[PDB]
Amino acid sequence: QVTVIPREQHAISRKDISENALKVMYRLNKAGYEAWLVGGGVRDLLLGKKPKDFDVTTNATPEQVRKLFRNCRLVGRRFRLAHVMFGPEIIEVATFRGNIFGSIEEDAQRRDFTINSLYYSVADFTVRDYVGGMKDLKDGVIRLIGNPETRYREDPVRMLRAVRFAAKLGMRISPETAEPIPRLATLLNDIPPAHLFEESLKLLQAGYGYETYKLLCEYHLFQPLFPTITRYFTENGDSPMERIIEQVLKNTDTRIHNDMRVNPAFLFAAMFWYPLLETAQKIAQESGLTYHDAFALAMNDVLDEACRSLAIPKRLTTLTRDIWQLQLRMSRRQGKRAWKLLEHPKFRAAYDLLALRAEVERNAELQRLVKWWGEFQVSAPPDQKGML
Amino acid sequence: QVTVIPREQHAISRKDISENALKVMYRLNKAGYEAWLVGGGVRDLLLGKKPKDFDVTTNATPEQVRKLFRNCRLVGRRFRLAHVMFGPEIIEVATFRGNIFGSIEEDAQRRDFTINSLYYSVADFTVRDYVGGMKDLKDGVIRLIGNPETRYREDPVRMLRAVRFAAKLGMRISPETAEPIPRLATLLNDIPPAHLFEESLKLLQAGYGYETYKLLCEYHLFQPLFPTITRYFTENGDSPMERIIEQVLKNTDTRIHNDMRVNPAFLFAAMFWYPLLETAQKIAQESGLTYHDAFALAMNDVLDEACRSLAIPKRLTTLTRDIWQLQLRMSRRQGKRAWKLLEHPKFRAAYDLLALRAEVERNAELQRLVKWWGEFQVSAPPDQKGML
Numbered sequence A, B: 001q002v003t004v005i006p007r008e009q010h011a012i013s014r015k016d017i018s019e020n021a022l023k024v025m026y027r028l029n030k031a032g033y034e035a036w037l038v039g040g041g042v043r044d045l046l047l048g049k050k051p052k053d054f055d056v057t058t059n060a061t062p063e064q065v066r067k068l069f070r071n072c073r074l075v076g077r078r079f080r081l082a083h084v085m086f087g088p089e090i091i092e093v094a095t096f097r098g099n100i101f102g103s104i105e106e107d108a109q110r111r112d113f114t115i116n117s118l119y120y121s122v123a124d125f126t127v128r129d130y131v132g133g134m135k136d137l138k139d140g141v142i143r144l145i146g147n148p149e150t151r152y153r154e155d156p157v158r159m160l161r162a163v164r165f166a167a168k169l170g171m172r173i174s175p176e177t178a179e180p181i182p183r184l185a186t187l188l189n190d191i192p193p194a195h196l197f198e199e200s201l202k203l204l205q206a207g208y209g210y211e212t213y214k215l216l217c218e219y220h221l222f223q224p225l226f227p228t229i230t231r232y233f234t235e236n237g238d239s240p241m242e243r244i245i246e247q248v249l250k251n252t253d254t255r256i257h258n259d260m261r262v263n264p265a266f267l268f269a270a271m272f273w274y275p276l277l278e279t280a281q282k283i284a285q286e287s288g289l290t291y292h293d294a295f296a297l298a299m300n301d302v303l304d305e306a307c308r309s310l311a312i313p314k315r316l317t318t319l320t321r322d323i324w325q326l327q328l329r330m331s332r333r334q335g336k337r338a339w340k341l342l343e344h345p346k347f348r349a350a351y352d353l354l355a356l357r358a359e360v361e362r363n364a365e366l367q368r369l370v371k372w373w374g375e376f377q378v379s380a381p382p383d384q385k386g387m388l
C-alpha cells in the first residue's frame, strides 16, 4: 500500500498545467485550510492528457467557504459543493464527507471508482491514494470502491458510469466490478426517467458513443433504457437499424472530436427511425387508414413508450417530430415548396437522416433523392429554379 | 370631374377581400365618424392583386380615436397615425389633414401619387377619386400630385418612392413628374443617412431590385446613395462588379417571390465587394503591407464612406465584414480548420458570395472552390473526413 506519492515519482503532474483554480486553493491554503484537486482532471493529468474539469475539496465547512469567498462571484447553492466563477472557467469547491463532514480518507470511500478518486495538493505536490487508484490507473482498470453488489443497489446509475469510463479511456472493468452488472441491470427502471436522460447523453452524445454502445450491449444495459429499440434487434447481427445506430454514433463521434456541435434531437430521431417505420407498417395494414395519418400515430406511441424510460424534454421531441415529418415531405419529388422546406430550421438534420437512411439501406432510389437535395442546396437561385 | 366610382363599375374591390380590419371601420362608422381605406391596398385591390397592408383614414380627432378604442389593443405614439393590433395584422388609423386637419378632399392632396390616393368606404362600396387616380391606374402611370418641382424639394425622398412604384408596378412615370428628377436628384445628400438606409431597402430588397436599379441608374438617383459604387462603373457596361450587382439583385428578387428570408448584410457585401477588392490592391502596393493586413484597412475605408451616405446599422456591418473575411479563408485550401468554418453563422452567405464571384468572373480557379465547398458541405463526416 502506498498512500502518498511525491511529485518526483508521480507523473510530473506539473503545477503549471492546472490553469488558475490555483487561485481558488491558494486562498484556502492561506486561510488555514486544505486544498485538494479531485477526480477527473487529476486522473487525466497523470495520464498526460488535458483535464476537462478542475474540481476541488476541503476540510472547510460550506459556511466557512462562504465567508472566505463572500467577496467572490459564487454561483448558486446545492448542499456542500460551492461554485466559484471566473467565467468560461468555473471551479467546484466541495467539502469532504464522512457525522456529515469528515476527513480526506473518509471522502475517498464515498467516491465511485478508483482512478476517479485521486487527490492533488498544490501545497505539497503530493497525490493521495487511499484506494487502488495509482495502480488501477497504470494497469488500465476501472475498479469500483466498496462492495459492488451494494453500491449498484444504492445508486444503480453507478453501473452506467462504469461502462462510460470503460469506453472513454482504453480501460477494462475489474472482474468483481463487472460480475454484478448483467444481473443487476434491470435496476435502472427504479431510476427517474430524467436522470437517465442525462446519462444517455453522457454516454453517446459525448464523442465516444460507438465504443460505449458496444459496451452497453455487452452488459444488457442498453435494454433497460431503450426498450422500444432492443426489441427490433435481430439474430442476424446487422439489420438496417442495427447498422444505422452504429453509424449515427460513429459519426456523432467524429463530429465531437473535430469539435463540431451536435443535435441530440437528431441522434434520437435516427435510432428510433426504423422502429417508427415498423409501427407505421402495422398501424397501416391493420386498422387500415391513410399512410400519412398512420405515420403520425406511430410517432405519438414510439415517442410515448420511449419517453417512458428516458425522460426526453418536450423541446427535443418536437424537433424530432419535425425531422421525421421532413422525411415524408422530401420523398415526394415536387417543386415550389422546396424553398419552404430548404428554409426549415431542422432541414439540415433532416437531410442528414436521409443521408443515413440511404447509406444503410443502399436503396439507390434514395441516394438518388440524396444527390438531388445535395445539389439543390449548394446550387444558386438561377439553377435552383431550373431544378424544378 | 368624375369623383365617385360605384362598386360595379370599379374593379369590384370586393368587401370579401378586406381583412377583418373591417371590424375597425365598423366601430368608426357606427360611431358617427366616417372611415375610408387608402392607397397601398385600394391600389392593389383595384389591380386585383392581394394587398399587403390595410390603412384606414378617418375624420375623427386623433383624440376621438384614442377614446373610441380604449378596450382595444392599440399600440402607441405618432401624431395622428394611430395603431391597432390583432394577430399578424396591424391596422393603421390616421386622421385626415388640411387648422391642421379637415375634409376628405383636403387629405387627398397631401398624398404623394395619384393611385396611392384612392379612397374606399365599406359603408357604400364606392371609391372616391380626387386625382387622376382611377384613369392613371388604368393607364399605368405614376404621377406626383401637385407641382413636382416644389414637392420634391419639400421631401426629396418622394423621388425615390416615385421610382420604386415605377418598377414595382408595371408602369411608366408621368412626363411632368419625371423631368425634375435627374436635376433635383442630388438633393438626397441633405437627407439623414437614416432615412436613406430605410428607403434603400424598400428599393432593392423588396424583390423588385433589378427593375428598380434599371431606374435608379437611368435617373442618376443611384449615385447620391451609393457614391462608392457609381465611381467604379465602366462605360463598357460589362465589368465584373457591374455584372455582380445585376445578378445579386436578380437573385434577391427570386428569393422574395419564393418566400425565402433574405439577408441585407449579404446584399451589401455583394455590391461593395469589388470596390473592396480594389481599395485593397491599391493599399497593397502604395504601402508595402501584407495582403491580409492590407485587406483589413480597405474594409474600414469602404464602410466609412458608404456609411457617409447610408446609415448602415452597426449590426449589419459586422456580419458583412465577416462575410468578406470568410472569402480569404475559403481561399486557402484549408485543412482541419475547415470544420470550424463550416460552422460559421454566415458561411451560407459567404458561400453564396463565392458563388457569384466565381460565376461573374467566369473564373475556373474560383469555380473549383465552389464545386468543392458544395460537396464538403452536404457530405457525411465519413466522406467529409476524407475530403480533408
Ligand SMILES: Nc1ncnc2c1ncn2[C@@H]1O[C@H](COP(=O)(O)OP(=O)(O)OP(=O)(O)O)[C@@H](O)[C@H]1O
Pocket: A039, A040, A041, A052, A053, A110, A111, A112, A113, A116, A117, A155
Ligand atoms: N452517487 C454517487 N456516489 C458516489 N460517488 C459519486 C456519486 N456521484 C459522483 N460521485 C463522485 O464524483 C466524482 C466524479 O465527478 P464528475 O461527476 O465531475 O465526473 P468525472 O469523474 O470528472 O468524469 P470524467 O472522467 O468523465 O471527467 C467521482 O470521483 C465519484 O466518486
Ligand SMILES: Nc1ncnc2c1ncn2[C@@H]1O[C@H](COP(=O)(O)OP(=O)(O)OP(=O)(O)O)[C@@H](O)[C@H]1O
Pocket: B039, B040, B041, B052, B053, B055, B110, B111, B112, B113, B116, B117, B155, B165
Ligand atoms: N412625407 C410624405 N408626404 C406626403 N405624403 C406622404 C408622405 N409619406 C407618406 N405619404 C402618403 O402615404 C401613402 C403611402 O402609404 P405607405 O407608406 O404605407 O406606402 P404604400 O402607398 O402602401 O406603398 P406600396 O404601394 O409599396 O404598398 C401615399 O399615398 C402617400 O401619399
Ligand SMILES: [Mg+2]
Pocket: A055
Ligand atoms: Mg462531480
Ligand SMILES: [Mg+2]
Pocket: B055, B092
Ligand atoms: Mg403606412
